[model samples]
Target: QTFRRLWPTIAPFKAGLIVAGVALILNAASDTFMLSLLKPLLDDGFGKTDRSVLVWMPLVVIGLMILRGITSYVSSYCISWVSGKVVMTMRRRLFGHMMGMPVSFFDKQSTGTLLSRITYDSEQVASSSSGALITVVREGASIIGLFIMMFYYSWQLSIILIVLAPIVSIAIRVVSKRFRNISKNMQNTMGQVTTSAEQMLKGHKEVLIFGGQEVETKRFDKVSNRMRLQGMKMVSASSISDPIIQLIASLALAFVLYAASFPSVMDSLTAGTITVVFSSMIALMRPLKSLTNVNAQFQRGMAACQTLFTILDSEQEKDEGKRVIERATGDVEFRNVTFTYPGRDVPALRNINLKIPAGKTVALVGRSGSGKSTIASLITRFYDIDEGEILMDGHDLREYTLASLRNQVALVSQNVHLFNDTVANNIAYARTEQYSREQIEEAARMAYAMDFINKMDNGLDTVIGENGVLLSGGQRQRIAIARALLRDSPILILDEATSALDTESERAIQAALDELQKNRTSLVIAHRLSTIEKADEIVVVEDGVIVERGTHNDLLEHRGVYAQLHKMQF
Candidate 1:
């Protein structure tokens, strides 16, 4: 059943694999044919009186050698062609499907596991498929060549060799039955090993400053040692299975020699014929051994396919709404809305009712986990609320197609994410065909990012490296704001967007945010009281319910949770 699922992945590469198989067959047959010629050379050609026998047989041998080299190259290259293509297709489909999966799906696993599936799983699967198929088919041709050699001289020995084929099969099945289960644990261990190593490397600076090297070393050694043990076990199993197959073939060889000793067999068999079958004995060993390994690799590949299917089979985010608008009016409303994360029983938001007029600013101020971000989650429809409706421009938020809905909203959050790309390219990002460098520069200027970007060595063309490692916290925030500006959506979300900025930078960005907020509805989620004081309305949330809401001064006069929060910061 698992192999059945894995077959479709190989379907597209069938033509290439078939080409590889043809090459493989030729190479193996060439090898076996050389062995078949050995008996003839020994009996008639080596000490021949005729000089023509020596000349022509040597040329034939040389020609076959050349053919072997060419066929091996073609076979290996074709395998490479199929493998790289299969891995490419698998990566594209897996990554594309993952991009469509729900946030909950991403939340359900560790980053290392997901990373391993994308990188490790695909390569291993392709290799497994390659080795498994080539090993079986190539060895099959080798075995057939051996049979043809035996049948040419002695038909009875060919029958005896054919009789041992099933025992070799059962040994492979028994050997690899537990091999599949072993790899699942191996892959899981790989995830842990990667996670721990990643955690160490990513936090290397912290470890240095705090003198945590000893602790981390021991921790890393513990997990790494575990990984090594599993790896060695996998290596050991393969090692054992190879020679077990060789032993089985050796036993078959013994039985065939005994069978040849009978009177009728002895009467027909010549010294040359006995030498022929004996030479073919070791020849069949390679094919049968490979045949067993094929079974092993096939089982291993199926295990990996099941691993990846876990990610691909995850449910995608719901985005099936029919209603779509060219541009929204930016009026957003939440009416009696309730929400709870899938895992948690407690409601994250409860019976929330709110409205923000187009071109106005409404601030959601709350303590941590008080459901401020949950509102943003709903506005973006990251999660569908349990009860009640969210409306934008008087239409239910869910009614608008998700892409159109997202197109109307631009988000700038506290945790700014910048690609390892150029200043202009990163700001412009994906809309390069529509937005030019000049437009990107204009947006950067508006976000107050132009000053620092201009001072950088390569300016807009500079590679920022991973997560903008070259930039400061404030610099990253400015670049993020610039990206949001370039988006130019009707709705803007500032979820702690300016949290990393110092007082001076905050005031500086205030000018840009003020200008940007002029004619668009802005949802500002902030813990910092001053940033949102000028908001048209401030809603205070406490433990998933709106405790108080009004203008900054109105909330202060009311002396509620908002006032207490304002007092703390002031």
Candidate 2:
């Protein structure tokens, strides 16, 4: 079971599946026994005109028919139930695991393929587990039962049929080889189609404004065409396979008929025996055929399982520490730390030596590609550095539990994110039960968000569209600030936290940040030189190198990189 980990969910339903399996075997046995019953019916009831046989025959057949029908439904339903559970379990786990994955994993994988894994890939995997599994198991036993009946009647005919089936086996193996290649192509191209379609949907407004339908259609066509071509190739292979296997089976049956026509063979074959044996041989074809087809579906499922398994089995964000802290003293230190992003050739930060004592403010000033943001990133341990260590209150940051460590830090980044929920819920976010309307609004007021929020139709209850599309840039950033304020963490990382606001609105939020910055360790990242003028310490960075460090006037007097930057702004 590729999905064995999901057994906890299915454990309660195990009885249903077990009953279904037993019923499945019983149904196959009944069908074979009915074919055998023809021997007794023909010889005893009709030929000898037996009254007991007439009375018992229809009732026995009717009872078993009812039994078979009931079991059939149970088997199909149980398998279907299990398959849906398998798919649902996978959907839940994949999404949770996807979110838990490191930021770097998202860069390596596309959203399109990831969506395909969640939806299309899971459904095909469902089909493979459900419908195909039933066929492979029950139909396999059915084929074996039919072969036994034929062998009991006449070994000669059974052996001849077995001889011819292997030729079809060779043909199916060749067919399977081709189908396997096509199936893999189909799986890959299906993900591309989903990805392309999703991208098209998300950016349709951009496409519509630019008159770029032709380009979008061309892009869609490239992926869709690959999927269609591979599907047709599968069709061609299947069609080529079906007829040739049937041809071999039909030839074997005809050969049996010819052998039986001779006088010496005819003496051994009675009407009842001949009918049962012939029917058993003919019944073997469908289940035998089903086995070949079901194998391919299993292969398809295995491909999808491996893809999902790779993701689920990946390295999750490491949170190995057992240390828990209610509040950090807010002292932070970066000692000779060096870091490069996952895919980048150049390091983002090199040998950075920085420290902010509790109740102090440090402002990082740098160009767009300089290491200001990287320092903020490191403060939260988003990406571990390649060399050196980071300490929070004399203990290595890694020594603290990720949750407790993060609980002490509040992050407000340049790009604000808001869920498509009420303004209150967006402010509360995941910790909704812990907040009240009064608490959320209090935080909002501090961040200057309530000014716009109160003007909205529903006030705090208004449903802000995805990422706060309903709000202005300043409004969205204020909400983010309000969220951080509600957290009230000791170590603050404000990465361009007020970039969206005008001078009037910027001062209002900055004033609140100034109040919050007192009695806490603060790291401010800004390119707008004026914002960080009041920071206790100003550090200037260039090309991953810290070229200047001092108090504002001290650096200005030194006339270094910090002074040149101050000249450009002033």
Candidate 3:
């Protein structure tokens, strides 16, 4: 079943593989023919004192050797080219599929596991495919050609050679089964190691502040050691298979040599015939060994394919709407909407009803589990509601294509993520191809990112380290705002966007947000009541239900959840 899915990528390379296979066969035949000539020149020419035959035979052998070399090179290069293309196409397809998954999928799977599938597992498929293709074409053809030549030279010797094949086959089958299991374990352990490393690095600040360096080191070391043990087990299995096959081949060779020395057999075989037979044996030995050893690599490749398929087989988020919405007016309505995350018994938002007129700013203030962030996510359709409907511009959100719907909204969260790219690139990410350079600059200026951007040596072109490591938290937040500003969406969501900033930075960004919300519909999710005190309307929520709704002063006058929250903050 898994191989069937992979066949489309493999099918395109079949023609090139066939051509390479024919060249490999020709090369092997030429090698066997040249070896057959060695005994003729040595015994017939040297024994009969025929010097002319010796001179001409050496030149013919050299010509055959040259032809063999050319054919081998052509076979190798062609197969390699085809294999690389197939693997590249597969990698791109897998990555594209992964990106289209729902946010919930990312929540379930770790980043390290996803990265391993992309980097490590994909490389395994490439290595196995490339090596397998080349060897099956080259060594496989050589073994076949050698077998044919061996039969023509001495059928008895060929039959004896066939006897030892089963012994090597059984050994490979048993060892490869064990290797496959170990390879799967190794792949999983490697993912754990990646997970541990990523977590340690990402939380380095927390580790330093908490003085947990030694604890983190011990945790990481445990994962690394498990990976090392699994790897050693795979290597040990591979190591055992080779020597067993070599010992069997040696026993077969001794028997064949003894049979050739018998007087009756010696009389039937010419010196040239013996040389051809022995040379074919020596030639078959390496390919036979390779054929058995390739089993381990084949098993590893299959295990990687299974891992990749696990990701590919996961249920994808449905994007069913085909209607394209050019622009949204940001008039949002939640009618009896209820949502609960997977595996959670309690609903995140239940029977929620709300309305926000176009171009109005509304603030949602509540305790930690009051579903403020859930409301923001629901507006963007990040997770579809379990019941009821969310309407945008008088149409249910599900009625619009996911892309077009998302295009109309921009979000800035407390934890802002910036890619490792130029400052301009980061700011321009919201709508890269749509905006011109001047427009991007204007957005940055509006978000208060332009001043610091200009201070850098390369300005907009300065490369931010991974996740904008070179920038401070406040600087990254400003960049996030700049990205959101450039989006120019009709609706904006701010989920604790100012929580991570200092008093001065928050004030600066709050001012920018005030300007940004002038003609745009904004949903502000804030723990601090002061940030949203002047909002057009304030909605107080508690335990997944809206408890109160009115202007900030009106809510304070009521002395409900909003009033208590305000008091707590002060």
Candidate 4:
């Protein structure tokens, strides 16, 4: 799975990779050649009357060292550059894909886990891939160059070395599999720890109010302990593999040394030749050790890749049409629409048919889970209808592109999300490009948010904390209203938008909403019936179906669901 997703990003960097490979080969060859020259310099320059050869030999070795250094630097830089760019590309694509997903996807996944994938997982891929590529290129080429030299000097010693290769390979295979499993477990445990910590921080006020700090702390401690245990397990497994490889290699080295010392074993070998062979064998062992360690790094990268691709592979939200719908007539109709959330047996809304005419205000009132917000979501096309079609200005919702369809409507829901940005940025979010400074100020004034904006020290530039935590609930809701007003869409849906405001704030916001709704169609989902007493129409929904609909006074005269609800409320 990791390789499958990673290949496209890697394919473009193949040229760089090839260059790195060549550089690595050149660097390793130079190193091996320099080591082999030691034999001739010691035997010829010292024993014979060739003093000039000894002086020139040091210069030749230094040149080879310089060449090797340059190649090594180039190879390292190229590999790092490729890995960093690939990881960055992955990060952008993953984030964009996540934003395109439906609201239901967010409902199931934790923000912390998602954040870890975007941040920690991508970082892991970057580090592991960078290190692994360098090791594979440099150490792999060195091992190959040194082995060729070893075989050239003496095939008998080479054969012994090759015989021990299987033993080392077997040990690596066992350890790598264990490391892969433990590394995967460790990543999952770490994600859980991240999620718990995020929850504790986000819900700190609730924890303090309920005096559940001790309980929350203990829970966090347990999760931390689990993460620590898994990390220790991975460390223990990784630690054991290196020693086993070293032990086997040590035995092989001992045998090679004894063979080199044996005069009768290979009479053709001179002392200088034996020395070169021994040096090459020792040189090859370090790279071989690196080759073994590379497996653990590869496993870690593979695990991270697997987790990252899980998000990339999940079902993406439907976004079909590309046509731009500039303006809609504000006529919305739900025709026999039925939708059941993913993984749920019952339908959230079933076979519902309704019409909201242009330039009028209507309110939906019901008990919890009566599909009031679901209607708003469907009207906005947040989720596709399962059974029937929704129409906007006599066109099917799917006929318009997601951008155009959503551009025609504005929504203010119960949970108002705000970035840690300026007040002007928050208010002008919908029409950042089109609206000027004056237009933004006008919208803020209409939403009753201008007063608070003027009160702040920075005015329009004041930075709101995360999720607007620094502001009161009423202030946040008004800012959301201001954002929606700045959108200036023809259709507006308010899903308990004023639920957070006190009476004074609510009255101010209500006046602002009244001014904004002058000629636009509005759908109001209210918890309190009195808020919408003057609505053009009132719809009573119960158990996924609208059971009653009429004017406020007519519904009161009918003595049905609407009257019963009004009676209960008053």
Candidate 5:
């Protein structure tokens, strides 16, 4: 079943695989041919002084030895090449699929878990599958070749292998089944360990501030301890099986010797012939034992491939809309909209009706968890509404293709994320080729980011640390603002864009934000009432319901939730 699933990936490398298989077969043939010389060495070359026999035998041995060397190198090179390409292809495929997944999918998976899938799982499938393939083919061919010589020289002695083969094979099968289940659990534990360490590192600052060193360490040790136990289990299974099979084969060898001493067997068997058969039986042991060892590795590789296949086979984001648009008019409406986040029964937004006319600013103000951000997220089609039509320009939002719809909207989220890249690159992060250096610099200037950017040694080219760790909170928000500004979309969503700024910085950037709202439809989500007083419409939300909405002064006069919030802030 696994091979059938993997066939498409392996299909492209058929030519290389053929070459590797041929080389391995030839290498096995060389070993078998060398072993076949035992009869000649004992019967002709040693006792009889046939110089021709002595000369040709040694020459052939040296020639086959060199041939074996060349074939081994070729097979090793081809197998590794194919395996590396397979790993690269799988990793790329996994990453591309992940890029197209819905945001809801991401909410369910941790970053470290996904990262481990791409790096660890893909490589495990490649190494063990390829390594085990080489062992199975090369050693399998050698075992077959040796058995042929054994039967030809002495069928009486070779009968022992025929009887005992099934026993050893069954032992390997049983061990591999045990290891297969262990491999799956180990993969899960590995993902957990990765996430545990990642959480610790990313939250290192919080840990130190809260004095959680011991707590974090204990948490990590618990997962790592599970990994250790799994490893020991794997070692135990592999170790016991190898020796147990060897013991069975040794008993078979004892039977072979006993059977050979019978009067009927002794009459047919020459000393050279019996020796050749005995040596051939012994030669089979190494390859048979190796096959047993590789069976464990093969099972592990299959388990890893199973892990990756689940991810690749998962459903990607739904991009079913056939309509496409160059741009949207920026008018948005939510009619009787209701939504509940996945894994939660409580609705984040109830049956709500709202509208923002083209080229207008609508501010959403509410206490935390009042569904303000949920409304903003809905505009971008992050999570489709459950109960009503979300319209853009009087058409259902789903009528437009996701790419075109998303292109029309720009977002500056509360959690600003900047890449570890040049200041210029960070500002031009979206559709990088579309923005010129001047446009990038202009966006930065408009965001009031130039003051700090210019002081840096490289101006716009200086590399920021991860997520702009080198910059202050205010500076990071400015960069995010600069990114949104450069997008220049018709609709803009700012969810706490200015929350990170101090009073002075907020005032300075407020002018640019005011300019940014000109000729664009904007949804401003904020808790600070002063910033929304100038909004064309201010909507107060509470517990998934809109309580009040009107001009700032109109709501204040009503003495409702909006007014109460205003009074408290003032």
Candidate 6:
């Protein structure tokens, strides 16, 4: 069932698969022909000393060896080409599908497990579909051909070997079950090992500063040891099965040899005829052992396929809106809206009503988890609202296509994510529109990022390291601002953008925020009362409901939730 799912991926390379199939058959036929030649050599050439038969025999042997070599190489090469293509194609599809998945889907998945699907799982699929496949086909065919020759040479002796076949098959079936179960567990352990390693490396600085080396080492050892144990179990199962099957084959051979010793059999058997049957029986062992060995790899690949297919089959993010807008007026309003986050019973926001006119600022102030950022998340449609309407320019947010709607809004959040790239490219991030270098520089200047950028040796061309690790908190914020500035969207979101910075850095970034907010409808979510004092209106929220809202002066006079919050800051 799992293998059938891989067919579509393999279907395009049918020509290559056909060539490989033909090569495998020819290769198996050549082995049978070689054994058949032994009969003629022993009976006619060596026994009679016929000069013509003896003279050409060695040349035939050499030519058969070369033919087998070419056939095996062609079969291996074609199968490898097909499997390699499938691996790359699956990797690309998995990655591309993941990018379009809903945020809720990501919430349930770990980074390590998802990464395993793309890297390790895809490679396993190649193993099952290619090398193991070749082993099964080529060796399976060889076993059948050799058995036919054995029966032809002496059916009475061949009957003993054939009687042992069912017992050998039953033993293989039991071993195959064990190998499959072990392979599935090992794949899971592999994911844990990858995840643990990634976590330890990502937090290396914290581990060092907090003196947690012993703790980390012990934690990692547990997962690493688990992987090692699973690996050894797989080896033990594989190691035990091989010899047990061989013992059964040897027992059958013992019976065949004993029967041949009987007077009636000995009288009828010629040296060449008996020798050919014995050699054919011995050759069967090699292919049977290989077929058994490949079962474990085949099982692992099937397990990998099941995991990868589950992810690919999941639904992508819903983008049903057909409307595409060039630009929006940035008039945002939440009317009788209520939203509850996924997996939480309590509403994050309830009956929330607010309006921000174009080019005006509205500040949302609240204690932590009082649904401030949830509002921002909804504005970007990270998760759809449960009830009521979020309108943009007098149209429902859902009316606009996700891409078109997202294009109008630019965000500068507390956690500024920058890629490891030149400063100019980071500033110009995701700007599909063509731009001049001067425009990138101009955006940087407006965001107050020019101070540090100019001091750098490479200026805008300097790489910032992962997530701008080389830059200071304030510098990172400025670069984020620079990116948003370059976006030049009509709507802006500043979600605690200055909360993590020192006072001196805050002053510089706040000035940049002020410039960034000009002529834009902005929603500023802040913990600091000082930052949003000049906002056109201030709304205070508590327990999923808006408690009070007005100008800072009006809220102060009213002495409500907003006034108490302001008083607490002072």
lDDT of 5 by residue, 1-570 (tens): 598888789889888888988999999899898988878887777757687888888989999999899998898899888888899889888888887676777766888888887888888898888878788899999988988888778776667678777776777667667766776777787787777777767988888899998998897788778768767876777577667767777777777777777834458676677778767777777777678778667778889899888888888777657566556564677767777666474558676666566765667766666667767777766776567766677677666767767777777765676776666787665568957778888777767776577776566667755645588766666677777778777667676534456888777567657767677766677666567655555656565644344345445554755667656732
Where does model 2 exceed 4 Å of error? Answer: 1-13, 26-72, 88-100, 118-126, 148-167, 178-239, 263-282, 319-329, 343-346, 359-365, 419-426, 429-437, 455-474, 497-521, 524-540, 547-570
Candidates by lDDT, descending order: 6, 5, 4, 1, 3, 2
Per-residue C-alpha lDDT of model 6 across residues 147-214, encoded as one tens digit per residue: 88876777777776788766776676676677667777777877877777777779988879999989
Candidate 3 structure quality by residue, lDDT tens digits, 1-570 = 456768788787788878777887787778777776776776688767798898889889889998898987887787777767766886787787787677777766788878877887877886786677667766777777777887777777777777766676666566666766777777786787777777768988888899988998898888777767767876887687677766767777788777767634456576666777777887877776577667556767878888887778776677667566656575677767777764475557667666566765667666566567767776767776678776776777777768767777777776677776666777765547867778887778767876477776566667756644477777766777787778766666666534556888777677777667767767777665567665655656565644344355445664655566556632
In model 1, the runs with Cα more than 4 Å from the true position are 1-13, 46-59, 168-247, 263-267, 270-272, 320-322, 345-347, 420-422, 433-436, 458-463, 466-469, 497-499, 502-504, 529-539, 547-550, 553-570
Which scores greater on TM-score, model 4 or model 6? 6
TM-scores, all models, native as reference: 0.81, 0.74, 0.78, 0.76, 0.79, 0.77
For candidate 2, write residues 1-570 as lDDT tens digits.
Answer: 555644575677777667767878888888887887777678777878787887888888888788789888888787777777777887888888887776667766787878877898777777775667578668877777878887777776677667777776677677677767776776787676777778777998888999999998887887677667767876787677677777777777787777766633457666777788678876777777777777767767867877887888987887757575557474677667777766685557676555556665656665666656666766667766567666677776666767767667777766676676666777766577757677778777767776687777666677655544577667766777788777776567676534446888787667766756666666667665567665545555555544344345444553655566656632
lDDT of 3: 0.71
lDDT of 1 by residue, 178-210 (tens): 665776777787787778788777998888999
**lDDT (CA) for every model shown?**
0.72, 0.70, 0.71, 0.73, 0.73, 0.74
Candidate 4 lDDT tens digits, 1-570: 467768888888888888888888898889898988877776677766588888888998999999888997888788877877787888988988788678778666788878877888887887887778778888888778877887777777777777776676677677677777887877787787778777777988888999997998898898778768867887888788678877877787788777656743547576666677768877877776677678668778888888778778787887767554757564777777777665484557676666566765667776666667777876766677677776666776776778767777777765676776566777655657867777787678657887587777566667756644477767766777787778767677775534446888778777777767677776777665556765555655555644344345445553655567656742
The CA lDDT at 193 in model 5 is: 71
Model 5 residue 34 lDDT? Answer: 90
Residue 448 Cα positional deviation in candidate 6, in Å, after optimal superposition: 2.5
By summed lDDT, the worst window of 10 consecutive residues in model 1 runs over 545-554
Quote the lDDT for 255 in model 6: 74
After superposing candidate 4 on the true structure, give the runs of residues whose Cα lies further than 4 Å from its correct spot: 1-6, 26-73, 151-156, 174-240, 264-276, 292-310, 313-315, 319-326, 345-347, 391-401, 419-434, 456-472, 497-499, 502-504, 528-540, 547-562
Q: Give the candidate number with the greatest TM-score.
A: 1
Candidate 6: pairs in clash: none
